[PDB]
Design a protein around this motif. Sequence first.
Motif, PDB file in Angstrom:
ATOM      1  N   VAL B  11       0.851  -1.198   0.000  1.00 22.80           N
ATOM      2  CA  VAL B  11       0.000   0.000   0.000  1.00 22.80           C
ATOM      3  C   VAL B  11       0.883   1.242   0.000  1.00 22.80           C
ATOM      4  O   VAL B  11       1.878   1.284   0.744  1.00 22.80           O
ATOM      5  CB  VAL B  11      -0.935  -0.016   1.215  1.00 22.80           C
ATOM      6  N   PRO B  12       0.570   2.269  -0.803  1.00 21.78           N
ATOM      7  CA  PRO B  12       1.437   3.463  -0.836  1.00 21.78           C
ATOM      8  C   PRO B  12       1.640   4.113   0.521  1.00 21.78           C
ATOM      9  O   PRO B  12       2.762   4.524   0.841  1.00 21.78           O
ATOM     10  CB  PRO B  12       0.705   4.397  -1.813  1.00 21.78           C
ATOM     11  N   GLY B  13       0.584   4.225   1.329  1.00 23.42           N
ATOM     12  CA  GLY B  13       0.759   4.731   2.680  1.00 23.42           C
ATOM     13  C   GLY B  13       1.663   3.843   3.513  1.00 23.42           C
ATOM     14  O   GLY B  13       2.472   4.330   4.307  1.00 23.42           O
ATOM     15  N   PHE B  14       1.538   2.529   3.343  1.00 20.16           N
ATOM     16  CA  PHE B  14       2.422   1.556   3.969  1.00 20.16           C
ATOM     17  C   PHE B  14       3.725   1.373   3.201  1.00 20.16           C
ATOM     18  O   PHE B  14       4.457   0.414   3.469  1.00 20.16           O
ATOM     19  CB  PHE B  14       1.709   0.204   4.102  1.00 20.16           C
ATOM     20  N   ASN B  15       4.029   2.268   2.255  1.00 20.63           N
ATOM     21  CA  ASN B  15       5.197   2.160   1.382  1.00 20.63           C
ATOM     22  C   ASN B  15       6.059   3.408   1.542  1.00 20.63           C
ATOM     23  O   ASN B  15       6.065   4.286   0.665  1.00 20.63           O
ATOM     24  CB  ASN B  15       4.774   1.971  -0.074  1.00 20.63           C
ATOM     25  N   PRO B  16       6.806   3.524   2.650  1.00 18.58           N
ATOM     26  CA  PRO B  16       6.851   2.628   3.810  1.00 18.58           C
ATOM     27  C   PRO B  16       5.925   3.101   4.924  1.00 18.58           C
ATOM     28  O   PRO B  16       5.583   4.278   4.992  1.00 18.58           O
ATOM     29  CB  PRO B  16       8.326   2.690   4.214  1.00 18.58           C
ATOM     30  N   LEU B  17       5.496   2.202   5.806  1.00 18.23           N
ATOM     31  CA  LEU B  17       4.660   2.601   6.927  1.00 18.23           C
ATOM     32  C   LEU B  17       5.477   3.361   7.963  1.00 18.23           C
ATOM     33  O   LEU B  17       6.609   2.989   8.283  1.00 18.23           O
ATOM     34  CB  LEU B  17       4.007   1.383   7.578  1.00 18.23           C
ATOM     35  N   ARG B  18       4.891   4.436   8.480  1.00 20.58           N
ATOM     36  CA  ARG B  18       5.457   5.225   9.565  1.00 20.58           C
ATOM     37  C   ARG B  18       4.587   5.068  10.803  1.00 20.58           C
ATOM     38  O   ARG B  18       3.355   5.056  10.703  1.00 20.58           O
ATOM     39  CB  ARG B  18       5.529   6.708   9.189  1.00 20.58           C
ATOM     40  N   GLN B  19       5.217   4.954  11.972  1.00 15.13           N
ATOM     41  CA  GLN B  19       4.448   5.017  13.206  1.00 15.13           C
ATOM     42  C   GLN B  19       5.290   5.672  14.290  1.00 15.13           C
ATOM     43  O   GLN B  19       6.487   5.393  14.429  1.00 15.13           O
ATOM     44  CB  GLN B  19       3.952   3.636  13.649  1.00 15.13           C
ATOM     45  N   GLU B  26      10.386   7.660  15.648  1.00 13.86           N
ATOM     46  CA  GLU B  26       9.525   7.030  14.657  1.00 13.86           C
ATOM     47  C   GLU B  26      10.151   5.748  14.122  1.00 13.86           C
ATOM     48  O   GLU B  26      11.365   5.681  13.904  1.00 13.86           O
ATOM     49  CB  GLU B  26       9.259   7.999  13.500  1.00 13.86           C
ATOM     50  N   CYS B  27       9.317   4.735  13.902  1.00 10.12           N
ATOM     51  CA  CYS B  27       9.731   3.521  13.211  1.00 10.12           C
ATOM     52  C   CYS B  27       9.039   3.455  11.856  1.00 10.12           C
ATOM     53  O   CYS B  27       7.816   3.627  11.769  1.00 10.12           O
ATOM     54  CB  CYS B  27       9.417   2.269  14.037  1.00 10.12           C
ATOM     55  N   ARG B  28       9.824   3.226  10.805  1.00  8.36           N
ATOM     56  CA  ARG B  28       9.309   3.112   9.448  1.00  8.36           C
ATOM     57  C   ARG B  28       9.663   1.748   8.869  1.00  8.36           C
ATOM     58  O   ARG B  28      10.516   1.022   9.385  1.00  8.36           O
ATOM     59  CB  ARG B  28       9.859   4.216   8.532  1.00  8.36           C
ATOM     60  N   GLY B  29       8.983   1.409   7.778  1.00 10.58           N
ATOM     61  CA  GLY B  29       9.248   0.165   7.083  1.00 10.58           C
ATOM     62  C   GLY B  29       8.118  -0.305   6.191  1.00 10.58           C
ATOM     63  O   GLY B  29       6.943  -0.182   6.549  1.00 10.58           O
ATOM     64  N   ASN B  30       8.467  -0.848   5.026  1.00  8.57           N
ATOM     65  CA  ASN B  30       7.466  -1.388   4.115  1.00  8.57           C
ATOM     66  C   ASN B  30       6.695  -2.518   4.784  1.00  8.57           C
ATOM     67  O   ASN B  30       7.260  -3.319   5.534  1.00  8.57           O
ATOM     68  CB  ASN B  30       8.134  -1.900   2.839  1.00  8.57           C
ATOM     69  N   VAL B  31       5.394  -2.580   4.509  1.00  9.38           N
ATOM     70  CA  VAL B  31       4.518  -3.595   5.085  1.00  9.38           C
ATOM     71  C   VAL B  31       3.591  -4.086   3.979  1.00  9.38           C
ATOM     72  O   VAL B  31       2.738  -3.330   3.499  1.00  9.38           O
ATOM     73  CB  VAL B  31       3.706  -3.063   6.276  1.00  9.38           C
ATOM     74  N   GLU B  32       3.762  -5.339   3.567  1.00  7.30           N
ATOM     75  CA  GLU B  32       2.880  -5.921   2.566  1.00  7.30           C
ATOM     76  C   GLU B  32       1.508  -6.208   3.166  1.00  7.30           C
ATOM     77  O   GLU B  32       1.395  -6.698   4.293  1.00  7.30           O
ATOM     78  CB  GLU B  32       3.481  -7.209   2.002  1.00  7.30           C
ATOM     79  N   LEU B  33       0.461  -5.901   2.403  1.00  3.35           N
ATOM     80  CA  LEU B  33      -0.899  -6.163   2.841  1.00  3.35           C
ATOM     81  C   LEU B  33      -1.583  -7.152   1.904  1.00  3.35           C
ATOM     82  O   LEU B  33      -1.284  -7.192   0.706  1.00  3.35           O
ATOM     83  CB  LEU B  33      -1.729  -4.874   2.914  1.00  3.35           C
ATOM     84  N   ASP B  80       8.756   2.448  21.987  1.00  6.22           N
ATOM     85  CA  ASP B  80       8.163   1.955  23.225  1.00  6.22           C
ATOM     86  C   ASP B  80       7.021   0.958  23.048  1.00  6.22           C
ATOM     87  O   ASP B  80       7.192  -0.115  22.453  1.00  6.22           O
ATOM     88  CB  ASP B  80       7.694   3.137  24.081  1.00  6.22           C
ATOM     89  N   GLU B  81       5.841   1.335  23.540  1.00  7.76           N
ATOM     90  CA  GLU B  81       4.759   0.373  23.708  1.00  7.76           C
ATOM     91  C   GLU B  81       4.146  -0.027  22.371  1.00  7.76           C
ATOM     92  O   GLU B  81       4.092  -1.216  22.030  1.00  7.76           O
ATOM     93  CB  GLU B  81       3.696   0.955  24.638  1.00  7.76           C
ATOM     94  N   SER B  82       3.694   0.955  21.591  1.00  8.32           N
ATOM     95  CA  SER B  82       2.810   0.658  20.471  1.00  8.32           C
ATOM     96  C   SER B  82       3.548   0.140  19.244  1.00  8.32           C
ATOM     97  O   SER B  82       2.941  -0.550  18.416  1.00  8.32           O
ATOM     98  CB  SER B  82       2.022   1.909  20.090  1.00  8.32           C
ATOM     99  N   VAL B  83       4.840   0.441  19.107  1.00  8.55           N
ATOM    100  CA  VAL B  83       5.493   0.329  17.806  1.00  8.55           C
ATOM    101  C   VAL B  83       6.491  -0.822  17.747  1.00  8.55           C
ATOM    102  O   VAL B  83       6.328  -1.840  18.428  1.00  8.55           O
ATOM    103  CB  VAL B  83       6.163   1.664  17.437  1.00  8.55           C
ATOM    104  N   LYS B  84       7.516  -0.660  16.907  1.00  8.63           N
ATOM    105  CA  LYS B  84       8.382  -1.718  16.397  1.00  8.63           C
ATOM    106  C   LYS B  84       7.613  -2.795  15.640  1.00  8.63           C
ATOM    107  O   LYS B  84       8.203  -3.481  14.810  1.00  8.63           O
ATOM    108  CB  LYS B  84       9.221  -2.374  17.498  1.00  8.63           C
ATOM    109  N   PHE B  85       6.315  -2.963  15.894  1.00  4.44           N
ATOM    110  CA  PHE B  85       5.537  -4.014  15.250  1.00  4.44           C
ATOM    111  C   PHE B  85       4.147  -3.492  14.905  1.00  4.44           C
ATOM    112  O   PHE B  85       3.760  -2.382  15.284  1.00  4.44           O
ATOM    113  CB  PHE B  85       5.481  -5.278  16.136  1.00  4.44           C
ATOM    114  N   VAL B  86       3.396  -4.318  14.175  1.00  2.00           N
ATOM    115  CA  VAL B  86       2.007  -4.027  13.843  1.00  2.00           C
ATOM    116  C   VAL B  86       1.329  -5.353  13.534  1.00  2.00           C
ATOM    117  O   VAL B  86       1.979  -6.312  13.105  1.00  2.00           O
ATOM    118  CB  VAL B  86       1.908  -3.030  12.660  1.00  2.00           C
ATOM    119  N   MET B  87       0.018  -5.410  13.762  1.00  2.00           N
ATOM    120  CA  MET B  87      -0.742  -6.644  13.574  1.00  2.00           C
ATOM    121  C   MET B  87      -1.639  -6.580  12.341  1.00  2.00           C
ATOM    122  O   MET B  87      -2.416  -5.639  12.178  1.00  2.00           O
ATOM    123  CB  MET B  87      -1.576  -6.938  14.819  1.00  2.00           C
TER     124      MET B  87
END
Lengths: 88, 106
Positions: B11-19, B26-33, B80-87
Motif C-alpha cells: 500500500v502506498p501509505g504503507f510504502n513505507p509505513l510510519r508510526q 519514529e519507526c518506518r518500514g514497508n509492510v505488505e498487505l 516503546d509500547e505501540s510500535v516496532k511491530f504491527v498486527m
Amino acid sequence: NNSCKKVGVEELINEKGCDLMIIRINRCRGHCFSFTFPNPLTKKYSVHAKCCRMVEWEMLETELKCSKGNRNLRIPSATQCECFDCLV
Amino acid sequence: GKECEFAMRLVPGFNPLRQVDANGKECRGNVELPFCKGYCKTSESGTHGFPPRVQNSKVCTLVTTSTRKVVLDDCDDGADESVKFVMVPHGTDCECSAVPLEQHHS
C-alpha cells in the motif's frame, strides 16, 4: 470489464384465499469489479467496489383479488442496470 | 473461475509505513498487505413491502485464518509500547462476502 444485465422474472403469487396471479418484473444481475484489503492503520477494511444495481426503476402496482378484501401490491421493476457504488 | 484473486502488495501509505511513539521517535518500514480483487456476482431486485429493494451485494474479501506481526526496520531509538511491530490479519484465499459492506463506522 464489468457486466450487469436486466433479466425478466416471472413470479407467481400463490396466497391461500386470494386468486392465483402472475407478475412479470425485471431484476439486475451481473459481475462487477471490486477489491478490498484489511487496513490495520484504520483497523478496518478498505473497500473499492462495484455492484450491479438499478440506476432507475418503476413501481408496479397490482390488485390481489382476495376473498376477504382485495389488496394493492407495489413492486419496483428495473429499467436500466449498471455497475455502480455498492454503498449508494 | 474463482470470483476473486489473492496477491500480496505494498500500500502506498504503507510504502513505507510510519508510526510514532511518545517523545517523537519514529519507526518506518514497508509492510505488505493482503489484496483481494475480482468480480463478485451481485444483484439488486425489487420486492414487496419495506424495504422495496434487495441487494445481493458482495465484494472480494479475504479469508482470515491467522494474524501477522510485521515489524518496522528503520527504527528510531526508544521505540516503546505501540510500535516496532504491527498486527495484520492474514489468509491465503479470497471469497465473495458482504461483511466489508456492513462496518461503515457502525
